[PDB]
């Protein structure tokens, strides 16, 4: 029969974040952030903390799952909200065109840095790489991930 461990972590994470700190009272436990199957980062608990260094931008996520696993411990799971149909995200070479009536549009680069903010419509002039696009309507945020060659 496994025992319990104590885990405390924020309820939210910035779309631009680079790390995520989890307190846990079992040294050697493993804390991991994921979007079911995309493993976005992992750290071992040492001195009561795991500082998860994210391996990719999470700006294309609305939620992530925190999982903390330990030898003979009951696994602890938490949802974490990531905070920056009725739209289109278009790519054409180096330009990304985003449209959605009455929406906040945001674009983030592959280092999680926010590169563009506009209302309703924008054209963004990109560089080679992967971007996240956030379209924030009333009641709901959507995201897409765009590859620019």
Numbering used by the authors: 579 to 662, 672 to 736
Task: Copy the relevant paper text.
Gingipains are synthesized with a typical N-terminal signal peptide targeting them to the Sec translocon and are exported through the OM via a novel secretion system referred to as “Por Secretion System; PorSS” or following the naming convention, Type IX Secretion System (T9SS)7. Here, we show for the first time that the OM translocation signal, a conserved CTD of RgpB, has a typical Ig-like fold encompassing seven antiparallel β-strands organized in two β-sheets that are packed against each other in a β-sandwich.
However, diffraction quality crystals were obtained using mutants of the same construct, which included an inserted hexahistidine after residues S664 or I665 (recombinant products r664i6H and r665i6H, respectively), or by substitution of six consecutive linker residues (I665ADVAN670) with a factor Xa cleavage motif (IEGRAA; r665sXa). Each variant of rIgSF-CTD formed nearly identical crystal structures (RMSD of 0.760 Å for r665i6H and 0.327 Å for r665sXa, with respect to r664i6H for 298 aligned residues). The 9-residue linker (T663-D671) between the immunoglobulin-like subdomain and the CTD did not yield visible electron density, indicating that this fragment was disordered in the crystals. Interestingly, however, there was a clear difference in the kinetics of cleavage events, with r662iXa being far more susceptible to proteolysis than r665sXa.
